[PDB]
Design a protein around this ligand. Structure first.
Ligand code: NI
Length: 341
């Protein structure tokens, strides 16, 4: 059955709760973003109202084949009414179309659900600053002080300079970027833009990108692999064997590969700065691991919560074991004692 952390008190709303069949009482199902864990259980067979951003609606329609009658897209940064209750969707700074939702309850309680998010100080001057928030449903993916990472912009700058140098040294090198879902598009779009190229990709991936409301998209991406010097492949193919295999497929049009694996955190964040990063190399193929995160670091999460000063926190990630919950509650109390709320 649907856990309490996916229910919004004193409404018939749920959030990211599609895997439990019909939820008793639920009149509106919200979807924060188009990642399989969150949408799990949604298909062309679903027949209840789904509320979401315009981008998330495009994906539901075109990728999952959810029937149009059941998709209720809402604009961002706009007060809307859903089944008699005031809501606002805000940018989550996660993947394309990902939202946080602000719910103004009839009794006067205010609840923020972050979805998945990468906390940023620009969120301190949104509609959130206008009133007190009593309860916070929080993306606790990286809620532990070891989880540090560079800014998105540091990582992109590094990727850009690396790619530009390699292709100027060898104009027959191919650049490859690994991917498994939506998110982290700036990695491959920034590399292509410094090389004067479109990004080549499969038909399924191109169809996905065509849903994302990216300006001038037709000028940036193609299904003609031949004509492009940046290619997208599934993350699972980003290894020496998969990359040599792909190089054979391209018809001797390239004689070297440089590949990027955008990952979350891995243990080497605790010493290395982005400027120290060096690739793994076997022959004419080099692979760079780059920590491009679309989740809050510990410090980013802490700052946001200490600003917001919620009366209660409800974790939405790593809640499956008592040890994790206990650990997280300890950090929430520290933050509250330091900041005086
Ligand atoms: Ni996500």
């Amino acid at each position: 059955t649907c856990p309490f952390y996916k229910k919004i008190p004193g409404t018939g709303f749920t959030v990211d709760a599609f895997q439990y069949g019909v939820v008793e009482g639920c009149t509106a199902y919200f979807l924060t973003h188009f990642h399989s864990d969150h949408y799990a259980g949604l298909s062309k067979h679903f027949t209840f109202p789904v509320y979401c951003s315009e981008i998330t609606g495009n994906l539901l329609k075109n990728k999952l084949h959810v029937q149009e009658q059941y998709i209720h897209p809402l604009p961002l940064d706009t007060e809307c009414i859903v089944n008699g209750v005031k809501v606002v969707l805000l940018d989550a700074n996660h993947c394309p179309g990902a939202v946080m939702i602000l719910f103004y309850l009839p009794n006067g309680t205010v609840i923020l659900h972050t979805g998945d998010f990468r906390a940023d100080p620009s969120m301190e001057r949104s509609l959130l600053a206008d009133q007190k928030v009593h309860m916070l449903y929080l993306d606790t993916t990286y809620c532990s002080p070891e989880y540090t990472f560079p800014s998105q912009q540091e990582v992109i700058r590094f990727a850009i300079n690396t790619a530009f140098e390699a292709v100027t040294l060898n104009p027959h090198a191919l650049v490859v970027c690994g991917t498994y879902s939506i998110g982290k598009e700036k990695v491959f779009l920034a590399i292509a833009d410094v090389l004067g190229s479109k990004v080549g990709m499969s038909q399924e991936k191109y169809k996905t990108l065509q849903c994302l409301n990216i300006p001038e998209i037709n000028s940036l991406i193609t299904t003609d692999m031949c004509s492009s010097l940046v290619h997208l492949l599934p993350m699972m193919q980003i290894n020496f064997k998969g990359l040599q295999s792909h190089l054979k497929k391209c018809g001797g049009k390239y004689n070297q590969i440089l590949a990027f694996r955008p990952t979350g955190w891995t243990h080497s964040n605790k010493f290395t700065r982005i400027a120290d990063v060096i690739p793994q190399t076997k022959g004419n193929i080099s692979i760079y691991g780059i920590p491009y995160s679309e989740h809050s670091s510990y410090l980013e999460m802490k700052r946001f919560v200490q600003w917001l000063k919620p009366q209660k926190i409800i974790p939405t990630v790593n809640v499956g074991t008592w040890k994790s919950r206990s650990t997280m509650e300890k950090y929430f109390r520290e933050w509250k004692l330091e900041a005086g709320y």
